[PDB]
């Protein structure tokens, strides 16, 4: 869940 939170915050797939 802490991981889910940081993914929601930060996860990006660059073009």
């Amino acid at each position: 869940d802490k991981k889910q939170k940081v993914h929601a915050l930060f996860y990006k797939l660059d073009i």
Partner: antibody
Amino acid sequence: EVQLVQSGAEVKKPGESLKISCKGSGYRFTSYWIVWVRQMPGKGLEWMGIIYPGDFDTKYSPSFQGQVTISADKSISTAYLQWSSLKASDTAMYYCARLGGRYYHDSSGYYYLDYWGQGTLVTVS
Amino acid sequence: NFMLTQPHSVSESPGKTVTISCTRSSGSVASDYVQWYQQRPGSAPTTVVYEDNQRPSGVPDRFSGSIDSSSNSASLTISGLKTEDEADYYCQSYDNSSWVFGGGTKLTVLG
């Protein structure tokens, strides 16, 4: 070699505008978030905001929203922090930092500030 | 919304171990990841712990982070103290997308 290099010290007067910069080199600039952090003299760190240069996704601390603008220019690998009307209370050291890590949407992914700019002192008097 | 409270200062002689606490004022500390930063006087900060207890590459294993749910705190342990460890240390977590920093702790390595 990954490097974040900020612009030089600024001496301004209240009411003036200002744009300071954080240039990234040694890596794909558009692939990593840039954080800005403020530090008033003799005081602690304050988070200002964050920008993802790839799609310009930007978040601000509630205490800096509407006070400052964070931006980015892909072509020159540079993040910016800017004010429309400086106040004496903007006197501080400003740091940028790259959010590095493993950008995978699974449990191996992680994010942390792995490189820091050297800081830019802004003195407004 | 919450704050992170740290002792104003800690100290020990070289070779000893020091612990710096970071207490979350409201909400459980285990609800959001805690990072730690070292800032030597006059220099940019560097990250010494992320995600509660992960050590970045390049950081000596003398630095170790942990969480203590029973005291709603995070802690940074600095073991085998060296003179170069003298610095301010900041904890940091997240409040609904916003980053929250503790007030900082001055570590003095007694000379």
